[PDB]
Amino acid sequence: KKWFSEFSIMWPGQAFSLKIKKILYETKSKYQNVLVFESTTYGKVLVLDGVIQLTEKDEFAYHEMMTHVPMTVSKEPKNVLVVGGGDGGIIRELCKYKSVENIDICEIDETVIEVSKIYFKNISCGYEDKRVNVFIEDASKFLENVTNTYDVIIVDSSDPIGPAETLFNQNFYEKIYNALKPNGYCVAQCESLWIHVGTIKNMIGYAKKLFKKVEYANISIPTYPCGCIGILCCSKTDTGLTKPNKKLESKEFADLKYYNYENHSAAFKLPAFLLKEIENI
Amino acid sequence: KKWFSEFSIMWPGQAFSLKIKKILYETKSKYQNVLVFESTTYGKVLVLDGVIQLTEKDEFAYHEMMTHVPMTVSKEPKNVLVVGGGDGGIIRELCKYKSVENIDICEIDETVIEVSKIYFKNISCGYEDKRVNVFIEDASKFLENVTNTYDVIIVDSSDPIGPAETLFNQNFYEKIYNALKPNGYCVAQCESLWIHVGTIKNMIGYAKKLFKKVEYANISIPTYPCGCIGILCCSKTDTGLTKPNKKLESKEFADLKYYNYENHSAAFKLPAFLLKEIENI
Ligand SMILES: CSC[C@H]1O[C@@H](n2cnc3c(N)ncnc32)[C@H](O)[C@@H]1O
């Protein structure tokens, strides 16, 4: 058999590899190179521009922590936006909340959505739900023009090289502030503390120029570089996102596999060197 | 340049890689294949039987969490044993505690110690300290025969394939119980929750047959498979290891880079699926 290897200038000098059981689909879309393969031990894998976006084995960690952290704080969220997330994993998790009335998702690349509906049915299943509305657009323009405001915004982007380029700057962070209700929350993929500290600091900076409270949490997931990824957590109220206001006991949450009430708060207890690094921002 | 790749039947289907800047030393010792290289981005790397034991960039996470978790619980530890740990990183961390009177280290492979003194001076520096006494022996025999008992025992082994084979069974866990003071503690490398759950369960089982309290914590470290590794935490008293009894404010701890009072407790908040898995043991 052959191996798939994730190399990149975003993490020079290291690489992670998965053995290929078979290749399922490749194409160049209007925006990126898309690849889907069945791996030998992590199930099906979705790759964009040579970078792993998710795998069946572990995607639950990133989708549950990105969704349930803010959703368990926000008191009763009605209208939620997902940026990116074309695979639909965030949507799967949002659909578990019966109080939610509307879910918009703004994804730039329709190919991702359709590939996901074809090859990842357990991740894409939430596109069925009547509450879900899809927009094919650079979120960067979509937030410039949207008339509604949201209780929660969840920015499940790819990395800063590619179309996600426009999502990692100050102007993008204004657009989010404005598209949120006065007591709204944003969570955003914010990379690995083991190698991206300059970025993490920039991101935090941007958010601070607008939000009164910016926190950072960490998620263990094996198929992202260095085995972890961070959530940049933004709050307009001063009490932030580190503690849930509810517990997921509805039968729709019985199945959860990573997130729980305690490990919500735990994810915000970071290594000394990182705290040290993000003090004077 | 060329790449070093960590493959193994212990984690089929995945691999992590580091680019080689230069190879420093190779040999077959009486017990294992030893390799040391300078990597391009993680500094110097020590490899035994094709498996990464440590790197300069990140070793602090595993050595600080393995040392300071139990040492901050144990009320005033006098006599401490390290099993394995020939590189000396655990010793470096123990030497920071002035109340410690004696540190024994039982390592099977002297080549590791001497390689470490030669090529890893900032990790091996604690061999200088007058309190440190070295024994070259299978810890499995050494614990059968030792007359003293210890406040704390820290089992910094390599993986179960190799000489560490004898350290991952029930009989080994008896030997530790007996070599500990009545209110003593053991911490032991116990692998990744992302792929070793059968082992984790076995280990926990073994420990439970003797200790009244067995906890498991997790450490983010990029150069071990799946980016994390676990500490099996054993206690003879019923209150366990999840909360420190002291804070590291002596000037000798100013330099710490991962461990702190809060993230001590955080490391014990595990993913739902893992709790679920280790309930009826
Ligand atoms: C798979 S989750 C990451 C998703 O983010 C999407 N993405 C990247 N950049 C943007 C953008 N500017 N707007 C919306 N979605 C984006 C990618 O196409 C991918 O589907």
Ligand SMILES: CSC[C@H]1O[C@@H](n2cnc3c(N)ncnc32)[C@H](O)[C@@H]1O
């Ligand atoms: C580098 S830390 C891991 C150390 O554990 C050592 N080790 C492996 N098995 C044993 C054993 N049975 N007794 C003592 N040390 C061991 C290895 O030789 C290595 O130096």
